[PDB]
Design a protein around this ligand. Sequence first.
Ligand SMILES: Nc1ncnc2c1ncn2[C@@H]1O[C@H](COP(=O)(O)OC(=O)c2ccccc2)[C@@H](O)[C@H]1O
Ligand SMILES: [Mg+2]
Length: 535
Amino acid sequence: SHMLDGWVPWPESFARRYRAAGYWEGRPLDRLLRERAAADPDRIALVDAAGDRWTYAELDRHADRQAAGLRRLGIGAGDRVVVQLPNTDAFVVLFFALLRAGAVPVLTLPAHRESEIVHVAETAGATAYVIPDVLDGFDHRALARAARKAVPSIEHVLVAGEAAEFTALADVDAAPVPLAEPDPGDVALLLLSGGTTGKPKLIPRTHDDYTYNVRASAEVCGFDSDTVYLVVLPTAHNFALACPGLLGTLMVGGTVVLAPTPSPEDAFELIEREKVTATAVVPPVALLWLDAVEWEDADLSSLRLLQVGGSKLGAEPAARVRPALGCTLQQVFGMAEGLLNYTRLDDPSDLVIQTQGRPLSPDDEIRVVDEDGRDVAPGETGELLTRGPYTLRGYYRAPEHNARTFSDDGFYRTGDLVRVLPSGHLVVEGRAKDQINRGGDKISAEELENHIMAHPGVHDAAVVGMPDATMGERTCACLVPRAGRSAPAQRELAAFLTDRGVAAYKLPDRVEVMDAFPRTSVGKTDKKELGRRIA
Ligand SMILES: Nc1ncnc2c1ncn2[C@@H]1O[C@H](COP(=O)(O)OC(=O)c2ccccc2)[C@@H](O)[C@H]1O
Ligand SMILES: [Mg+2]
């Protein structure tokens, strides 16, 4: 019996291998803090952007108090809680308090709006929603009111700030209570995938596979008690949470330092002030920092490791990382679904510059296949399929999408196009999935098309990616105007999408209007040819 239904557990044969190999160590996710705080209670665990800092024993205690307060509210074993918080200490405490209460965090980003939040809350049948009050000029409590009208299961709303009619997250606090450990083979959290279908999809990560993700990534990244990790991406991003992210920093006893934004203004000062040794960024932020050192005077010398992932860093800026930033580059080809590829920190610089890494686990299995599903010859380009000790066997409550996306023997189809080199390192060559990668931000084309076509002037919509030198891809919305009406232009369509509740990173960069969409045989919209007609 598993505490949650709607997910697809590993076959018992694989489970026994991964336990025998020491990958699945049988420990709840919250135990990495409990254990580090018992051994190093007085070490500084967490620093925020203001300079406020907390020990391991203070983090562990506060998480115990907030787990107790959550239970006084009825948020307990197996309930799903949508979490949408900025890079604050409030997120870190709530993450471990939800785990210790038995609740399942459903992690969303600050940029997500009503469309994403309502669907994610509905799919998970979430019983609570955790928000800030106002962030980047948006009042998230308005969003929480709209979410509660569409999703009746939401009983509580916890606000990191002025809670209005809702519950203040700071008041969720009570004397610690003995709370039962969860089964380590159960789902610990739900991640939001970037998406390839009309509706976002949630990824269950179990305690055993996510601990191993964190533990093995910290080993390969040299994370130790002397690591000062700067959280530049959102705390809810798998990359900054667990690869090794903040959980890996806390697992080994380093210091987590929270950045409010990735701008040099904020990031470079925290690196100088806190003596940050490691961080992780997307390539657009990499290029910015690579530029900004020529007019910023911050001392960044404590930097030892810059991870760059989410999209492919080019070889020319990759080669600039050591001269400009004085640190080692690690390319990270990962996914919230599982498989992580890392360059090794002592790889020859050729491989750190030209490749996106090699798999994290000895039991990560890699297949590269052609259109006919057939394995390619060595060193040819095909679609990557993967199976392993921390890669999901199925999305959460998405059986139709599961039947298209995983092979009969359990291989997850990444939708990425790759080459495997003789050393085992991968080179990302492109994408088979219909998903735009806008500076690391993933845009499901089908989701956005369903949004655009709901506009009264749009009949059909085909969303196509465009190369961009600094963003990697931008978004073009190709529109067939509704019969005898005028399709909207770029600013009006963007305004319609915002009020419909679409995250701002999914707003099209460009609008193209045409009479019909190029079609292949079988009658599907040819977006390879649109990529040409719109050029
Ligand atoms: N270094 C890279 N080069 C080229 N493409 C990369 C890449 N890293 C991710 N990708 C692409 O993002 C997809 C997964 O994105 P996701 O938002 O779930 O998480 C990371 O994006 C993510 C999660 C954990 C660690 C790192 C990135 C991958 O399938 C791939 O298409
Ligand atoms: Mg340095």
